[PDB]
Design a protein around this nucleic acid. Structure first.
Ligand code: MG
Ligand code: MG
Ligand code: MG
Ligand code: MG
Ligand code: MG
Ligand code: MG
Ligand code: MG
Ligand code: MG
Ligand code: MG
Ligand code: MG
Ligand code: MG
Ligand code: MG
Ligand code: MG
Ligand code: MG
Ligand code: MG
Ligand code: MG
Ligand code: MG
Ligand code: MG
Ligand code: MG
Ligand code: MG
Length: 62
RNA sequence: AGAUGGUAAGGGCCCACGGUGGAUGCCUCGGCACCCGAGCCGAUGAAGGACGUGGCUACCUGCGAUAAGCCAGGGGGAGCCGG
């Protein structure tokens, strides 16, 4: 259901849009690295966080 | 003084049981033929690949650094996160 949620947020991301798109993506990107960085060490990772964040990025990218 | 009976190191034939081997029968996601349909794709980068892509992934499948996926329109009505 998280889809309907984030979607509206993105045309909502039309304060600055292409610019905030980029700002927001870059952010989600870091969170992703921070994530897999901790995922590699083992004792700081669950799971579904990644794929959810991965696809999260995708629709932002759209 | 004479006679003709036992032994099986092993071998043979037959019976029983077993090993090995994978024929025969049954089966079938595959193949074959015909008939009907349908019949082009590419510089808006094809056909076909290489590399990559999953939290743990060797291969196959799918996909392309948005990477077993992204958006929207239909379908569908309880399961789903390929093998
Ligand atoms: Mg721009
Ligand atoms: Mg994933
Ligand atoms: Mg955009
Ligand atoms: Mg004698
Ligand atoms: Mg004997
Ligand atoms: Mg003997
Ligand atoms: Mg056998
Ligand atoms: Mg042309
Ligand atoms: Mg050109
Ligand atoms: Mg191709
Ligand atoms: Mg990999
Ligand atoms: Mg996954
Ligand atoms: Mg990984
Ligand atoms: Mg890996
Ligand atoms: Mg592959
Ligand atoms: Mg990615
Ligand atoms: Mg897929
Ligand atoms: Mg999956
Ligand atoms: Mg899983
Ligand atoms: Mg399953």
């Amino acid at each position: 259901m998280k889809l309907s949620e984030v979607r509206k947020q993105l045309e909502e991301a039309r304060k600055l849009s292409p610019v905030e798109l980029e700002k927001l993506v870059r952010e989600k990107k870091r969170e992703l690295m921070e994530l897999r960085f901790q995922a590699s060490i083992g004792q700081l990772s669950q799971n579904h966080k990644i794929r959810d964040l991965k696809r999260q990025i995708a629709r932002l990218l759209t």
